Structure formats: structure tokens, C-alpha cells
A paper describes a structure:
The first two putative IdeR binding sites in the cluster (C10S1 and C10S2) can be found in the intergenic region between genes SACE_2689 and SACE_2690. We also determined the crystal structure of the Co2+-activated complex of IdeR and C10S1 DNA. The structure of this complex does not display any significant differences compared to the complexes with the consensus sequence. The C10S1 sequence differs from the consensus in position 3 of the first repeat, and positions 2 and 4 of the second repeat. These differences affect the interactions with one subunit of each IdeR dimer. Specifically, the vdW interactions with Pro39 and Ser37 of one IdeR subunit, and the vdW interactions with Pro39 and Thr40 of the IdeR subunit bound to the neighboring major groove are affected. However, the only notable differences regarding these distance-dependent interactions are the absence of the thymine methyl group in position 3 of the first repeat and the presence of a thymine methyl group in position 2 of the second repeat, as the distances between Pro39 and the fourth base pair are very similar regardless of the nature of the bases. The water-mediated hydrogen bond with Glu43 and Pro39 should not be affected by the different base in position 2 of the second repeat, but the water molecule, though likely present, was not clearly observed in the electron density and was not modelled. Despite these differences, IdeR binds to the C10S1 sequence in the same way as to the consensus sequence.
The iron-dependent regulator IdeR is the main transcriptional regulator controlling iron homeostasis genes in Actinobacteria, including species from the Corynebacterium, Mycobacterium and Streptomyces genera, as well as the erythromycin-producing bacterium Saccharopolyspora erythraea. IdeR is an OCS from the DtxR (Diphtheria toxin repressor) family of transcriptional regulators which typically consist of three domains: an N-terminal DNA-binding winged helix-turn-helix (wHTH) motif, followed by a dimerization interface that contains most of the metal-binding residues, and a C-terminal SH3-like domain (21–23). The main function of IdeR is to repress the expression of iron uptake genes when the intracellular iron levels are sufficient. When iron levels are sufficient for iron ions to occupy the IdeR metal-binding sites, the regulator is activated and recognizes a highly conserved 19-bp sequence located in the promoter region of its target genes.
Residue numbers in the entry:
A (entry chain aa), D (entry chain dd): 141 to 230
B (entry chain D), E (entry chain A): 3 to 140
C (entry chain C), F (entry chain B): 3 to 140, 146 to 230
Write the structure that this text describes.
DNA sequence: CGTACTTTGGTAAAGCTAACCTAAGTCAC
DNA sequence: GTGACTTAGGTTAGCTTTACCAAAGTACG
């Protein structure tokens, strides 16, 4: 199942990329958990965290810290549970 | 509210597996906003009907029958999201909430029509792969 | 099974009014295939919530809140039927059964998008007027007569206009109606009958078939 | 089935004995239908229309006519339905 | 009121056979004081469960299972009456009305104890033969 | 099954009072082996008819009419148990089960005759006081202690006085008690236990056996 | 001390069959 | 014109499972 065990093994979670030391990444998947908050989804579309758009993931240190991301049209703070639920290609 | 309790427990366990989270009854309580006793009782009912099992470490494993039904619900969900965005033009942020309900009433007959209509989609508008397209025969 | 009991009780009462049948609980039992005691206990539950009232002759009246909710469900149903026929291309006989479930999960937000997409539709694929389009924010049919009454008055030639929700529930019948050509916008020859509760014969463009008294009563034509 | 088809074939109903020209008879069976009326059963015991007692059945003519009987301690009027439900040996 | 509807319909048909009356649904309505529609509906339920059949001339015929059950109820009835007169000393005129209820709650275990106690009785206090004593084994 | 649902609910509430257990709807559910919703809907039906009331702590109180009816059924039960033992000679372990049905069909008229026949009995064959004898027209029990509590207080020898209706429902258990000699008017040796929910050991005249916490709570003795 | 789950006793909604009723109509003789 | 039964639409009682709740306790790390 490409859903749970992706065929593209270079798919990584925004929170794991952030803790690894940030990087420029292509947005691929937004999990169903993230989609459940309409206000957040509006904010993700506005700044440009949507599938097919490149984003900059700012390096973070420690667990339970918000992950700062920069999109094509602004930046936004992702909660660990949200950042975990967004998958990217670096 | 949930439309179908069983299908939302199955898909919620499926969601947690996609997110690489350990599917405990505690996670279902949080995400479906139901009390612990409610979730334990419903999981017990779904274990009795052979849709899932509770392991020694207490994480919920979907059975062959449970995974088959979870895949069916999710496939209907992500085909509905595509119809709602690509064809109907519902706002990007409102589509999951609509698909959250549509996923419970969609026939496999409509699924096959949507596959032709949408030009063999393999992902949702949010980039999530559509599972169980094999099972439709498309 | 019904997905939403309350909405289907409201919509069954609406269907019966549209078909000019007296809405008794005995009708809801027959149509939704439920026990008398279940219908009484559910109608009592809906009476408590002020969605209907039971009169002295025991016929069901929709309240202002009831009629509003009934129209809302019925609007979703026929916009659903339009979407499935016009856009998705689901087979004519399978559409009502699908729409029967969809009418309970469609948002008013989606209805608005569907009105735009489908070009402000005024009728279902089965010729039934779509109500409550005013609530979203978007013809004299007193000349229409029932196939049973036309047959009992001597028959003749007639244009098919409406097939009621009642009739749409049987996929095999709807497949028969389509093949012989008893569909909205097609001409038919209704054969004359004298007896009530007798099956009416009708001749379409590609053959003819038998209609039961309750089916024929639920098909409206213009002669 | 002694209940429905008596082994003693000479058992007769009070109404049949009355219509055929009365006679002296031993009371044998009082059916469950008769027992259902307590006031009647009290009257039947008082006058002696009870199993093991001899009674005199008065001859009657016509259907739907009450059958007069004489017991050891008085007489009483049986309705046709009651008289039918009492069986005797002549 | 009847305590057990099924047992009272069976025994009422058994009564009408003992009295050489043609057992119609009309006779049950009269004797149990129930409306015609009620009796038709209950007889249909008892036909469905294979306790009786409705003949062409519309008289009710007990089946093998129906006759067996009717005999069991009547046997309990007439043993209860013997206990109520010979042992308990309830008044002669009231005993049937009591046995009308007792006949529904008496076990075959008690029936066999009553047979020993009453010295193998073959008739009720009202002279009616006790059927189905073979079936007890006594 | 229950023969009379109302009378069995009333008698279950009475049983729980005699055993010093708080009468909750949950107790009726597990004892009469019915669903929670059944018990609530039936207790609601009996509240409406003024046979009981549901308190704030949700414990069931019998009204004057309810208590009267409860006593009436319990009187018929224990007079029936006496008749089946003293006169008919039904086996000790089968008597309660029979009486469970008889208590619902017996008239006061028959009760009066049974009082004379049985010699004005005051206790059932299981040592339980027969109540409501005043209504027909006809001892300090504070020194009695429960076998579970006797064991939890150190155990010791005791005389069996009462076996509650609860215990009598299991014929196989009653057959065991009879063979071991744990019956009214027999001495037993109760072995000591420390904790609740622990099975109590008891030694009779012809052997010994294990009692479950709920069984031992329902057996009363004099030490 | 926090997390996960259990025990206990509820609830409302939504279904069932058995067993009763009345009013009006049919049906054979 | 009855006596017998049916049609049509109820009713109450007495059951069920599903799917929700909260308070308090347990098991464990
Ligand atoms: Co989604
Ligand atoms: Co959903
Ligand atoms: Co339709
Ligand atoms: Co529907
Ligand atoms: Co009798
Ligand atoms: Co009876
Ligand atoms: Co007892
Ligand atoms: Co009982």
C-alpha cells in the first residue's frame, strides 16, 4: 500500500526534516487529520503549503516545538502533530 | 454525526497507520471526540464481528475483513474529494468535511463512474494515494 | 439502511402529499418496510420535536419546521439525481437508490455549487419539480392526470411527465419502463379498464408493459 | 381418547336425552364450558346435578328450549349450551 | 388474563371437540371474549408455528404438535382441580377458575408428584377424563 | 418466561432489600437477565402506574401500593414453596423454580386454604419469613450475620438459618448444599478469609464446598 | 504525576413480535 | 339477513442492539 508504506521511499515528514536540520522540499501529501481543521487548511493554501509547491522547512531543536515553514506567498507555524501529518520530497 | 460508527473507527485506524502513529483506543477517543469507555465498547463490538484485534501491546490491528472495509471507505472518500474539487468546485478547505460524510453512502457503481469521469485519478486533491482501485476492477 | 430515519419519515409524508395519497402511519410502514409499532413510536418522537402533528382522523401534518426540513431533503435528493445523470452518468434505474442515501449527507454549500454546475435545474431526471430553490438563494401542472384515472376514464394517448419516488424504488421496473419507452417526454397509449385494483396496459415507442394500480396512480401524463 | 370419544359408548348429552323423551340418568361429566360460570355451578351442586348423582331429565320439544332437570334436593333450568355440555348414563 | 394465549386457544379447541361442537374461530371469540380479527390473527400465528390448520370448511384442526400441547395443558388443569378439591379444599364452584391459571405454570415434575399424592386419578372432580397420563410415564 | 414482568420487578426489589443490597435497575438487569434499556423502560412504566419511584442516587423505592403488591407475590411464593415441600413432595432443589411461576397465578382464596392446610406457616422451606399474613386474615432476626461477613471477621462454627431467593435460582447448587448439609437447621464451620470477592470455604455434616461472594452474602447464620 | 484502559450504571434512538382493539366491508348460504 | 371471516389502522407491553455519556477505580511506567 502506497498509502501507509510509500513506493517513493524518499518521502519524509516535515517534523523529521525540521529536526534533521531543515531543507527545501516539495509538498506531496497532507494527511486527513490536518484536513479536519478548515481554518488551518485556508492558512496552508494562502502561504502555499499545498501538493506540488516547494517550501522551506526551518531547522528546529527538541520535541513539542512548532515547525516554521516558508511558502511561495508567506510563512506559517505548524504544530508537531500537523507537521508530522505533512509529507514532502527533499 | 459520524453517519457510520464502524466505518469511522476503521478509517481512523487507517489514518493513524498512514501518519505512522500507534493506533491505540486513546487516539480514536481524541480524534472522533468520544469518551474512553465508548471507544473500548465499540472496538470490543468490532473485535466480536472480526473487523480488528487488540494485540498484547494494546495497539489495534485491522483484520483481513477490517482492512478490506477501511480501504473501501478511504477509496470512496478520496474519489469524492476529487469530484468535489475538480468537477463541483467546492472550496478547497470545505471538501474533506463533505467527503467525511459522502464516503459512507457512495456505491462501488458510482466509484467506477467517477474513475472514468476524473480520468483514472491515483491521488486525492491533498496528494494522498487512492487505495483499492484494483478491487473496483479499474 | 434509511441512513436518517427522521428525514425519511418527513420525505415519505412529502412523497404521499405529491402523489395525492392521505399520509397515514400505515403508508410509512408499507413504504419504508417497518412495523406499525416502530412507525407510531418514531412519529411520536417527531411530534415531541415539533416536526409534525397527528390529526383526529390520524393523518400526518408537517409543521413549518417539518415542511422546511422535508423540502431541504427532497431538494438534495433531486439535485443528487441530476448530478448522477447529467455529470457522473450513473444508469437511469440505479440513480434514485443512490440519491436516497445522498439526500442525508449533502451540505447546502454543495447544493449551491450543483445549481451553478447543472445550470439552475427545475426538475429531476424523472420530471419531478425540485423544491426549496428559494432557500438556497437562486409552471401550471394542474392539467396533469394519473395513468390509472386516464385508463378508468376511457384511456387514449398521453405524454409521460412525472414518475413518483414510489415507482423509482424498483430498479428492475425502471429498467423495464426505459426499454419499452415509458419515460418523461415520451408518448404512450393507455388502454381502457373498468375495474379498480386492475393492472393498466400501456404501449410505448419500443413495446408495451403492465402497470400495477399503485404504480399507474404514481405516473402523471398530459392527454 | 376417552375425553372426545368416550370408551363407555352409552354416554349421552342431557339435551339429546331430553329431546328423545327424557329419562332417569346418572350424571358423569360436566364440561369445562359449564364450570366457567361459578353461580351456575353453585346451583348445580345445591340441587344435586354433580358426578355420581342420579337426575331426572324432563322431556322437551324444539331446539333453543331450556331443559328442566330434577335432582335429589330440587330442580333447575339448563340452557341448551349448558345441557349439551353435561353428559349422563341412562 | 389468559396467562398464555397459545395454550388457551389449544385447550378451547380441545373443549369444543369434547362437547362435539364444530371448532370455528367464532367459537373461540365467544368463549375467550376476544374480537373476531384478534382470533383470526392469533390462529394464523398458531398455524404459522404448526400447532393447527384451517380446513376448507374453516373448522380448526389441531396438528400432532398442537394436540400434544393441548393434552399437556388439559392434564395439568384436571390434576390441579383434583389437588384444589381433594387436598387444599377450595370451594367446588371456584376450583376451575384457579385451575384455569395453574394449568400454565405446572411442571411435568409436579404432575407426577400429584399422580402419586391423589392415588392415580383418572378423572377431574367434574368427571372429565384426565388425558395424556401415558406421556407422564405414570 | 417471567409470567408477570411487573410482579417480578417488584419481588426483585423486595429480594434486594431482604439481602441488604441497594436496589438499582442494574441489579434487576443481571438477576432477571434482561438488558439495561428493558429495565429502565419497564421501571418507567411502573413509576407511571405508581408502584415505585427512582430517587436522586437512582435507587428504587417501593410505594405503599408497590410494597403491598411486592409482599402479596412474596407471600404466594413462600406458601407455594411450603405446599410443594410439605404436601406435594417436590424435590428441595426444584421447589423455588416452580414457586417462581406459581406466585403469579395463586388467588388470596387459595392462600387462605393453604394457611389452614400447612398449619399457619411463618417461614419458607429455605428459612425465609413469610410476610403479608395480616392482609390474608391470620422473632428477633437482628442476631443473624452473613456467611461472607462471618468469614471476613475470622470465621467459626454457625447454624444455617436462611438461604435467599437469589441462591435458590441455581438447582445444581441447591443439590450440592443439600448433599453437603448446608441447609436451614444444620451447623457449618466457616473458614476465615481476608479479602472481599474471595470464595468462602464451608464444612457441613457430610463434607464441604466453596461459596461465591454473592452466594455467601445471601446465606445468613447464627454463630 | 501522567497515560491508558476498566468498572459501573446510566442514556436516547431505532428496531422487533405478541396480543389485544374498533369500524367497515366481504362472502357464502 | 344473519353468522363467519377479512380488511385496514391502530394500541400497549415487553423485548432487543447500537451507540453515546460521566464518575471513579485500576494498571503501569
Ligand atoms: Co479528506
Ligand atoms: Co466519515
Ligand atoms: Co428519486
Ligand atoms: Co433516503
Ligand atoms: Co375445569
Ligand atoms: Co387457562
Ligand atoms: Co424461593
Ligand atoms: Co416469578
Amino acid at each position: 500500500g502506497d498509502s501507509v508504506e510509500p513506493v517513493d521511499t524518499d518521502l519524509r515528514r516535515v517534523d523529521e526534516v525540521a529536526r534533521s536540520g531543515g531543507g527545501r522540499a516539495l509538498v506531496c501529501r497532507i494527511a486527513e487529520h490536518v484536513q479536519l481543521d478548515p481554518d488551518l487548511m485556508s492558512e496552508l493554501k494562502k502561504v502555499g503549503v499545498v501538493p506540488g509547491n516547494e517550501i522551506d522547512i526551518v531547522a528546529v531543536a527538541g520535541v513539542n516545538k512548532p515547525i516554521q515553514v516558508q511558502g511561495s506567498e508567506g510563512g506559517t507555524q505548524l504544530q508537531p502533530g500537523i507537521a508530522h501529518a505533512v509529507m514532502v520530497r527533499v | 454525526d459520524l453517519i457510520d460508527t464502524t466505518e469511522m473507527y476503521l478509517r481512523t485506524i487507517y489514518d493513524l497507520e498512514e501518519e505512522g502513529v500507534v493506533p491505540l483506543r486513546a487516539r480514536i477517543a481524541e480524534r472522533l471526540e468520544q469518551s474512553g469507555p465508548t471507544v473500548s465498547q465499540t472496538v470490543a463490538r468490532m473485535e466480536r464481528d472480526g473487523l480488528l484485534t487488540v494485540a498484547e501491546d494494546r495497539h489495534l490491528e485491522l483484520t483481513k475483513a477490517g482492512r478490506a472495509r477501511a480501504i473501501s471507505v478511504m477509496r470512496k472518500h478520496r474519489l469524492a474529494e476529487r469530484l468535489l474539487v475538480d468537477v463541483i468546485g467546492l472550496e478547497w478547505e470545505q471538501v474533506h468535511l463533505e467527503a467525511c460524510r459522502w464516503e459512507h453512502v457512495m456505491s462501488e457503481a458510482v466509484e467506477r463512474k467517477l474513475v472514468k469521469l476524473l480520468g483514472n485519478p491515483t491521488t486525492s486533491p491533498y496528494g494522498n494515494p487512492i487505495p483499492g482501485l484494483d478491487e473496483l476492477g479499474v | 439502511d434509511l441512513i436518517d430515519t427522521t428525514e425519511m419519515y418527513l420525505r415519505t409524508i412529502y412523497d404521499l402529499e405529491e402523489e395525492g395519497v392521505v399520509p397515514l402511519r400505515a403508508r410509512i410502514a408499507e413504504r419504508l418496510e417497518q412495523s406499525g409499532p416502530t412507525v407510531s413510536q418514531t412519529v411520536a418522537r417527531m411530534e415531541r420535536d415539533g416536526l409534525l402533528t397527528v390529526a383526529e382522523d390520524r393523518h400526518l401534518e408537517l409543521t413549518k419546521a417539518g415542511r422546511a426540513r422535508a423540502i431541504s431533503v427532497m431538494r438534495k435528493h433531486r439535485l443528487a439525481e441530476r448530478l448522477l445523470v447529467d455529470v457522473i452518468g450513473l444508469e437511469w434505474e440505479q440513480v434514485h437508490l443512490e440519491a436516497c442515501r445522498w439526500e442525508h449527507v449533502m451540505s447546502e454549500a454543495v447544493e449551491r455549487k450543483l445549481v451553478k454546475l447543472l445550470g439552475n435545474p427545475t426538475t429531476s431526471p424523472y420530471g419531478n419539480p425540485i423544491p426549496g430553490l428559494d432557500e438556497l438563494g437562486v409552471p401550471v401542472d394542474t392539467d396533469l392526470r394519473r395513468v390509472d384515472e386516464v385508463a378508468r376514464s376511457g384511456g387514449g394517448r398521453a405524454l409521460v411527465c412525472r414518475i413518483a419516488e414510489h415507482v423509482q424504488l424498483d430498479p428492475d421496473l425502471m429498467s423495464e419502463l426505459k426499454k419499452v419507452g415509458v419515460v418523461p417526454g415520451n408518448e404512450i397509449d393507455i388502454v381502457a379498464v373498468a375495474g379498480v385494483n386492475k393492472p393498466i396496459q400501456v404501449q410505448g415507442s419500443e413495446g408495451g408493459t403492465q402497470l400495477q394500480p399503485g404504480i399507474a396512480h404514481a405516473v402523471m401524463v398530459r392527454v
